[PDB]
């Protein structure tokens, strides 16, 4: 790592200087480091150049705006200070070159959209690893090789992807936030593929701004959900993009690449997905629950087919795809009710989780849930009303009551129902889960909402050992 080589594409006469790490933060800038002095909202890092220098950085690259000409080389206290115009726009490319272009040294798939990025990225990482990749994720749950995810600037993005390349990753599925894209945080990444899940003359400006942004990126293969109105508008303008549909939105007149679910059977342990595609037809046994997870899986499949992974190998490994832990996570047992563990802890998330569960439910849908104590009370009646409408049996119990009188929380929930008398109340969460699971019929579905992956019940100040997954697994005669 050398200032001269680093800047060779832009500043021909930059001085030779060994460089350790690249940092935007003058406070951690250490001996031998490259300090990058950027102007943001309020903040001007050029202010902290003297401090960086005094802490012994080998060199500084700085915003040229109002101070200098693009590629102007100064020298302060023996330290080279090189000025660049539009540093925020160019920071991805600078960090890419610094970290040896990590997106050129693995297959990077970007996933964008309002919902399904976490699931779609986890399915991409899992499926590619089943076919022999060493796969990683970068996103909301964190960064890391599959199974070792550790819970943000253009520099941090390149540095983290370099770290994954260093650990042997050959494939990375990356959640791309709308805000990340607009702030040029992935501006110089070589995406092998770009996946659109869904969105939500204003619409004219919004679209113009996004089209310009994406015209500037290396998107690779575009994989677009054609069931989304905005998805279709972009497929209209991208003849090489892959159309993915589970609601009959493939227009065969276009002769583009396509993949569509022809029929879906939502059953007690998953979904049987029959599909047709320009690669061939097939049937997948998904162990994931709900319509949105069919969409997410079909997007992962279309992407991997577009990248050249053979259909027969993808079909052969589909049954090993797993849910995101505690996200619509199914537990089934010989002649026991189907039980789904989901983290849903808001009115909207509860409604979606119940609507998803219902598709798989031939009998009665049960909803076991509560609301957190010493937190906003507003959601309590709203989650009551949702459980009453979208389930057949509401079991209201405790969920981290903390210092709040547990029954007061249950009262607030019941107050949102038309017929509170129809709700089952049971305190002890473990007892309420047992009550549902032991009373439910064989073709009933019990949704245990609010905790998902969390392994604790906060009663008072005590963080007690408790897992919904473990309680459910133990009651069904299976292993969490």
Ligand X SMILES: c1cc(-c2noc(C3CCCCC3)n2)ccn1
**What backbone phi and psi angles, to 5 degrees, belong to 11?**
-125, 95
CB of 219 to ligand X, least distance (A): 4
* Tokens 């499949």 sit on residue: 301
How many other CB atoms are there within 10 angstroms of residue 42's CB atom?
A: 5
Is 450 annotated as belonging to a binding site? yes
* Tokens 């097939």 sit on residue: 282
Judged by DSSP in three states, 209 sits in helix
**Size of interface with ligand X, in residues (CB under 6 A):** 11
Among 224, 288, 330, 353, binds ligand X (CB under 6 A): 224
Among 15, 85, 159, 214, binds ligand X (CB under 6 A): 214
**What backbone phi and psi angles, to 5 degrees, belong to 42?**
75, -60
Which of positions 144-203 make contact with ligand X (CB under 6 A)?
Answer: 194, 196
Question: What does the DSSP 8-state code read for residue 15?
Answer: P
- The interface region with ligand X, picked from 23-31, 207-215, 400-408, 428-436 by CB under 6 A, is 207-215
Is 454 annotated as belonging to a binding site? yes
Residue 275 interacting with ligand X (CB under 6 A): no
Binding mask 62-101 for ligand X (x = CB under 6 A): ----------------------------------------
Between 43 and 182, name the residue whose CB sits nearer to ligand X.
182
Say if CB 424 and CB 437 are below 8 A apart. Answer: no
Residues in the chain: 480
Within 8 A by CB and 6+ apart from 49, the residues are: 26, 35, 37, 60, 62, 76, 81
Please give the angle made by the CA atoms of 163, 305 and 120, to the nearest 5 degrees: 55
Say if CB 299 and CB 314 are below 8 A apart. Answer: no
CB of 324 to ligand X, least distance (A): 21
Among 81, 95, 189, 222, binds ligand X (CB under 6 A): 222
Is 115 annotated as belonging to a binding site? yes
Residue 112 interacting with ligand X (CB under 6 A): yes
Residue 266 interacting with ligand X (CB under 6 A): no
Within 8 A by CB and 6+ apart from 294, the residues are: 246, 261, 264, 271, 273, 286, 288
Which of positions 226-245 make contact with ligand X (CB under 6 A)?
Answer: 234, 238
* Relative orientation angle of helices 347-359 and 291-306, to the nearest 10 degrees: 80
Query: In the bound complex, which residue of the shown chain has the CB atom lying closest to ligand X?
Result: 214
Is 24 annotated as belonging to a binding site? yes
CB of 257 to ligand X, least distance (A): 14
Binding site for ligand X (CB under 6 A): 112, 194, 196, 211, 214-215, 219, 222, 224, 234, 238
- Residues forming the annotated binding site? 24, 26, 41-43, 113-119, 177, 183, 185, 375, 399-402, 450, 454
């Amino acid at each position: 790592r050398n200032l001269r080589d680093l800047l060779a594409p832009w500043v021909p006469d930059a001085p030779s200087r060994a460089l350790r790490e690249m940092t935007l933060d003058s406070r951690v800038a250490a001996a031998g480091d490259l300090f990058v002095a950027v102007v943001g909202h309020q903040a001007d890092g050029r202010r902290y150049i003297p401090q960086a220098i005094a802490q012994g950085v080998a060199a500084i690259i700085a915003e040229a705006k109002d101070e200098a000409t693009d590629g102007e080389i100064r020298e302060m206290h023996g330290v080279p200070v090189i000025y660049l115009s539009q540093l925020n726009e160019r920071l991805s490319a600078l960090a890419g070159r610094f970290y040896h272009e990590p997106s050129d040294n693995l297959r990077l798939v970007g996933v964008t959209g309002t919902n399904g990025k976490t699931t779609t990225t986890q399915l991409l990482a899992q499926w590619s690893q089943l076919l022999g990749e060493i796969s990683a994720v970068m996103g909301t749950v964190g960064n890391g090789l599959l199974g070792k995810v550790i819970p943000g600037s253009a520099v941090d993005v390149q540095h983290e992807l370099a770290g994954l390349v260093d650990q042997g990753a050959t494939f990375c599925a990356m959640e791309v936030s709308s805000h990340g894209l607009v702030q040029h945080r992935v501006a110089a990444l070589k995406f092998a593929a770009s996946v659109f899940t869904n969105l939500s003359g204003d619409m004219e400006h919004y679209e113009a701004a996004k089209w310009l942004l994406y015209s500037e990126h290396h998107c690779g293969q575009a994989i677009i959900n054609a069931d989304d109105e905005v998805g279709r508008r972009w497929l209209a303008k991208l003849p090489d993009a892959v159309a993915v549909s589970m609601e009959d939105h493939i227009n065969p007149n276009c002769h583009g690449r396509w993949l569509k679910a022809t029929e879906v059977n939502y059953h007690d342990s998953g979904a049987t997905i029959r599909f047709s595609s320009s690669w061939g037809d097939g049937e997948i046994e998904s162990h994931l629950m709900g319509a949105f997870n069919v969409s997410n899986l079909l997007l992962a499949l279309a992407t991997l087919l577009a990248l050249g992974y053979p259909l027969a190998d993808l079909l052969k490994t589909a049954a090993r795809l797993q849910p995101v832990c505690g996200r619509m996570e199914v537990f089934t047992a010989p002649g026991k009710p189907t039980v789904v563990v989901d983290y849903a802890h808001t009115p909207d998330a509860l409604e979606k989780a119940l609507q998803a569960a219902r598709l798989h439910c031939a009998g009665k849908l049960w909803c076991v849930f509560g609301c957190g104590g010493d937190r906003d009370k507003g959601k309590r009646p709203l989650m009551g009303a949702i459980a009453e409408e979208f389930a057949d049996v509401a079991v209201v119990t405790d969920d981290n009551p903390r210092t709040e009188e547990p029954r007061a929380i249950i009262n607030d929930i019941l107050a949102g129902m038309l017929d509170a008398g129809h709700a089952k109340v049971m305190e002890g969460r473990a007892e309420a889960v047992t009550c549902a699971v032991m009373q439910a019929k064989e073709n009933d579905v019990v949704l245990v909402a609010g905790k998902g992956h969390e392994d604790y019940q906060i009663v008072g100040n005590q963080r007690l050992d408790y897992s919904d997954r473990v309680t459910v697994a133990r009651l069904l005669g299976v292993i969490a």
